[PDB]
Amino acid sequence: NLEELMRTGDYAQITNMLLNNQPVALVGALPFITDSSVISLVAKLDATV
Amino acid sequence: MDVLYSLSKTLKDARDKIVEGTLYSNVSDLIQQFNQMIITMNGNEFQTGGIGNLPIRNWNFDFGLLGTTLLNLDANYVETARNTIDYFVDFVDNVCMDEMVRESQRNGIAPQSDSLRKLSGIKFKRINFDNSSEYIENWNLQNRRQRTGFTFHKPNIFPYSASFTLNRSQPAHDNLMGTMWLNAGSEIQVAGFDYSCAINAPANIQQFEHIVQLRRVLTTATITLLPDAERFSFPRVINSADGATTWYFNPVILRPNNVEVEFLLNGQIINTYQARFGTIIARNFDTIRLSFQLMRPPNMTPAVAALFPNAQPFEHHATVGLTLRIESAVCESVLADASKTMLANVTSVRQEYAIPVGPVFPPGMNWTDLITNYSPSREDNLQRVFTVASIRSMLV
Amino acid sequence: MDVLYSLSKTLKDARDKIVEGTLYSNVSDLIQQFNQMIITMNGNEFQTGGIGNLPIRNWNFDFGLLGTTLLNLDANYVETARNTIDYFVDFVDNVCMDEMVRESQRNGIAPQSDSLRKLSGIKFKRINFDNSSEYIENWNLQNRRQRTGFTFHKPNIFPYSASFTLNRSQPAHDNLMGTMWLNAGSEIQVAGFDYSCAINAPANIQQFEHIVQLRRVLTTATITLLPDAERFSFPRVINSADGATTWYFNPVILRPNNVEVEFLLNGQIINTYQARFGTIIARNFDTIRLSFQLMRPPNMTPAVAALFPNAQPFEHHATVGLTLRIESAVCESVLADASKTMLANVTSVRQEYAIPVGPVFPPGMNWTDLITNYSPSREDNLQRVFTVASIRSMLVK
Amino acid sequence: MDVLYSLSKTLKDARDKIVEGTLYSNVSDLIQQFNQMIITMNGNEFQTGGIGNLPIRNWNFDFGLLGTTLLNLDANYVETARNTIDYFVDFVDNVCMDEMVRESQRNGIAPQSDSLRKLSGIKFKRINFDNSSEYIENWNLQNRRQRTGFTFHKPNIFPYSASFTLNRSQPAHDNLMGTMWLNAGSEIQVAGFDYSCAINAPANIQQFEHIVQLRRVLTTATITLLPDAERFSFPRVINSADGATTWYFNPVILRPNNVEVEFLLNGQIINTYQARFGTIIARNFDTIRLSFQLMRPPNMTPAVAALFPNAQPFEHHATVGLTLRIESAVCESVLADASKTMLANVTSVRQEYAIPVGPVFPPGMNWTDLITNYSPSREDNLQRVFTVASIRSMLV
Amino acid sequence: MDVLYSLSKTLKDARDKIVEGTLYSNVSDLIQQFNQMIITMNGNEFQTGGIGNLPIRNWNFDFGLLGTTLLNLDANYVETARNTIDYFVDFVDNVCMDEMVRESQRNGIAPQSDSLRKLSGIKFKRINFDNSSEYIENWNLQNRRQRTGFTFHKPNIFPYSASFTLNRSQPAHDNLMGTMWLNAGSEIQVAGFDYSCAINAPANIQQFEHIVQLRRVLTTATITLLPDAERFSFPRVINSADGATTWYFNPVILRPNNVEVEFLLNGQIINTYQARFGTIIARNFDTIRLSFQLMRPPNMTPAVAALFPNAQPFEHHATVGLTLRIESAVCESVLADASKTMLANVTSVRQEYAIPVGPVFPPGMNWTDLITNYSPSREDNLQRVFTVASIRSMLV
Amino acid sequence: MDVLYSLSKTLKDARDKIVEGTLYSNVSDLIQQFNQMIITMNGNEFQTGGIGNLPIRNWNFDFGLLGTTLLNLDANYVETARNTIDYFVDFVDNVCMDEMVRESQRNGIAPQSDSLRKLSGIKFKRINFDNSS
Ligand SMILES: [Cl-]
Ligand SMILES: [Zn+2]
Ligand SMILES: [Zn+2]
Ligand SMILES: [Zn+2]
Ligand SMILES: [Zn+2]
Ligand SMILES: [Zn+2]
Ligand SMILES: [Zn+2]
């Protein structure tokens, strides 16, 4: 839960999962970028955010 | 093993300390250790079972960390923690059961289950913390080749054996001299009998000797000596040595004479007790030598003299007993005892899931056969399963 | 209960850890727990003991907090802490004694004394901290209705019973066949006797059976089985069943034949041991069946043959024994055992203050009566009083 | 003692908790206590031994502190800690052994070895921390003059004594009335015998009494009482009281009548049980009175009537037995029991180094002599050495 | 179980309260609970199992919420609600049936069907609301370790048994003294018969005693006691104990004498009624002891004196009877009774789908075998299935 | 014991040395010790027990200091000192009697009566002075 992560300030679990490439689901109202570029998909820019 | 023990102890501390209304300061270190365990275990896939009737179970860890409270824990915190604790406890119990049912002739001290083998990896060493139980302490010492010590109340050191030896006998079994003994658990009960009551023995003394070779060295042992062996003080019909015939025993009990208990280590006399009964201390020994004598009473009342004629037939047979009871001791190796449940736990787990007989332990984990042939490989495997059994006992 | 246990645990930790010269870092969490206890108990009145000879004690709490500015504990700090600890320990002892002497037919697991009832309020739940003792852990598991477990060394599971059964008899009591047993504590000594030594038996085999029904299920039980029963291997003069006369028992011990120990749960075979002696494991059972045979030795030496004639009179009577000893076991219910003092403590407190017989427990806390009729209400009350006894033993003992 | 126990406890916690991969949060307080111990012990010279064959050993303490900036402990930290831990453990073991082998009459509670006397200084109290063990807890209670308590499983309270008394006797020993008993550890087997089967008794009843005085008061005692004394239920030839001759005992067992076991404190009846067998509770007592009766069976079958004639000879002798076993108890004084090992440890240390017999304890640390004459000075010295033995058992 | 009951109660309330023309204020909270249930169940896949002939069924939930903005409910609202209610009722009924046909030995109180196990998850705890029915209330109280009881009208506590005991008998069965009884359901009929009419009995009184040991403790029990057992008051031809022959019974009914009915708990007399008939109250008991006496009438008219001669043949046999009917009671455990339909529902569901015999219940859910061996595992499974059966009865 | 002995010694010295007409230089150190004893004992409540027929006695200490500033002790000084000394001597005698009648099998060298156990605290160590007997 991104709200709980924001409120606690403890980023140990999220940091450990992102460093170790552990599949996760971040839940919360999020703005998103609509990308229509196929080259962006090939470049895998969605995994760099 | 250390990581599995640490998981179990973290879960035990979580169950004991994470209780409603407790100050967060009473659990701060415990909560940090628990969250470290959650971080280390998350994302790891484990499998247990697949042996006998133990079901195959797959374990996944996708738990969030335990939170914090300003002053005291509330009910919500306890329930949220208890869900995770329950899952982890189920996992730990299953891992312990998987490890307890396995054995190896080669490297019997090493983990045998896939889950415990995975838990021995470097990544999980983070979970390791306080190792204060007796079994885990001895495990760590043994891994370092340090002197181990297990304290047993009434150690199960003597394999069951009810046997006799006839030093003088003949096919009619009416004039017999010998010894009959029971070595069961932590108890020795020996009795030397002479049918002629040492009428023709030199100086009217008949010497009886019993030797018990302990399969492991016992140290700091408290032992109770009693003059009489009640188990062999009543008349009984005993099979022959070859089972062809039965003979008759009709004890009349006399005080054992010149009693001598020698506790020996590697053939060297360590402790000697002469005509001493009650509590004695055997500091370090692997052999017990009980030497006693039937001394014919030089003076007898008419009733007593009636029982012991100058010649045959002998109807009342003079018996001198001796009872030895190891109340407590210390052994460098693991043994069954009346105070612990490790053997019972391992045997129960093996019986419940119908584990086929392996190449290390005897069928059914029978203690008599196990202690009779207590090989170093058997010792390693039994220490491993006993340590896992204690780890499981922390939670189950 | 958890609040009372937490009080006792805090006081024991204070006695053990608040010592002169110790680093404040060794006790900081303990000092916080102690001050939490002081704050929670301050301003509260308690009353303990209006049953039997137990005196009415009134308890007031107005104590200052322990300091936290020190780096190493000194003498004066320890003495003030000891004064507060002594008062609190006396209060906890009296509360435990008051709770141990009371029983309820309805909610025996619930608190009975008014002091423990008051401690069961929300405001005192703050005192609750580490519940690590075996009895309190089992209490908490049972409250949530999880699988409880109590480990007993030599569990007292068999009520005392020294009796006999005659399968063959007649008024002269000179040709008897039957069994005599003692079931006491954790021990069963049984012995089957035949006065004729199975001379006219079907193939010279006499079958003896003994069924012992435990009042609670035992798990993970280590059991020693020995072939002989020394208790029934000497001459005896035994009253008849009606007490009209006395008969003579002159046993000669023969080894038992086809020994079979069966450990059953709900009339279903869990464990079976055949001709096995020494240490055995009964993993889960509530009934024991010992079946053993007296087999006439086909070949006898002249003395043995003289023992057993072809017909009466039978001067020597063949006997085959068995001894069973539960060394250790696990039971989901509380029990008296050789190692613990819970039953002894409860009985001692009840006798000391002359507590009248209640509607739950037998007249005098007699364990044979209790285990003979170990009802669920008796189980609840016994678990409650045993847990309180352990809590008290943490401090008073 | 408190300082020595604190040293041992700190070392044991260092062994258990300073392990590879553990969070520094799990050991921070322990590391602080360990460094405090190093600081307090540094610059101090100690000397142990010099008694019996215990070698003289000199101990110097110049050690560096452990690090405190780690997040998780690694191999280097563990080895650095373990060197100091090994030296300190050896020092503590030697101090404990030196203290266990010494005794004083007037002030036996106070430290005897020079090392422990030096450790009893004010400056060493900084080492002092958690005193949670039962023996150190009782030591601190005794030092504060509070009520003390030790729980014993099967307390060894009865010195060994197999004796008899003949209330009716003749030189031929054919019409004997009396009682024979064994008191051993936590066991009392008594058996009253009448050779005439109380045919001439007033009401055909023979009254037997046995009073056993305990050398210390036992409280919260759980006892098992059984109606037969197997020890005296078989035929035996027994020496005479003066040893001049021997007599014949041929028991036939009848159930005891009007059994009454009384537990007394200072001559006042605290507990009483009539015709009660199984588990009983003696809440507080120092004496046991077992009074039983042999009642002649008014109705006898022809065999039973054949056993007991109207007059001599009496070939079958009526016997009624009682068995009393203290399974658990609480005593304000230290005692040897089946579950603990302090007596064994002290005796082993005294034996291994050939400690000359002192002015307090009996030779060889024999328990029967010690408990027979359990004087206050002996109690002081025994409590001291038992506490030292427990402290040593924490490490060795 | 709480979530399943909440689903059933929500559906029952929806059926009862969502009716055309009703004010929305009459259903506002009900509609809120129904929408909460829809939200919690939406997106979840469920499977009700294929045990026996019960078909495998799959359940999906993608329902929309109900309106909340009308002043009064109309036909469209009722139809829209009914479309969802039918599906939810079918799902709940199938889950209840799947749970009712399953049993376990280790944990019979825990859910057995995978659907109910899924519903026991935290995510479904939102569905839980008012738990007011007796069975769910008892379930919740028993999960809280709180004293709770079920009230039964004519409890089925006595296993069926029509038997007799002959204290005096002979191969010809013409002078018999004994007792006959039927213990069936909530009813006990007993009758002591003497063929000689106590002609040669001490004081011309024959004592009969009948003990019925209840398998569970009953409390606040209203009981009708009547002085005659009509079941054993007419001529009968009765098989012998071994079935070898048949004997003749020709009762002549006399008033029972010294009628003492004791209701005992743990062997202690809780309630006693002497010569009392009609309504009596047994407040708490587990055993019923009926003692009565056949008293030979001291004075007999010539017709009466002809029935009871001084010796054989005895053609009229004097019988005294008692009848004990438990009209109402309270039991900690669940029981079959004449008022409730739990046993009937469970048996019907198990019979209709050919559920094989399991390891807990007897074949066909036979109540006599069930209550004869009412083991704790049987009690747990029976309470579980009975609660599920009540939940289903709320809808089916 | 050393505190009790010091109380007795101070009282005996006061009785022997605080006499009418004596130079203050003959008692200066004695007066200092006596005032130290008064300060240490002031505000402390003692109880001599009721073992046997020994009466239960309660002792309260609220005494002014002995004066300085006299060249030779006069009668008023000696009277005030005698009042204080009489009360203190009664207390010390009762404490000694209470201690003399008690015993313990173990730790019999330690104080038995509550008064002497209280006197064994650190705060009373100030009273301790010359131990010459
Ligand atoms: Cl034991
Ligand atoms: Zn032979
Ligand atoms: Zn034991
Ligand atoms: Zn009989
Ligand atoms: Zn003699
Ligand atoms: Zn009706
Ligand atoms: Zn018949």
From Swiss-Prot, chain C:
The N-terminus is blocked. Sumoylated with SUMO1 and SUMO2. Sumoylation of viral proteins seems to have a positive role on viral replication. Ca(2+) binds at residues 266, 286. Residues 62-73 are annotated as: Interaction with the inner capsid protein VP2. GO terms for biological process: fusion of virus membrane with host plasma membrane. Pfam families: Rota_Capsid_VP6 (PF00980). The VP6 trimer contains a zinc ion located at the center of the molecule. The zinc ion is not essential for either trimerization or transcription activity of the DLP. Zinc-depleted VP6 has an increased sensitivity to proteases. Belongs to the rotavirus VP6 family. This is Intermediate capsid protein VP6. It comes from Rotavirus A (strain RVA/Monkey/United States/RRV/1975/G3P5B[3]).
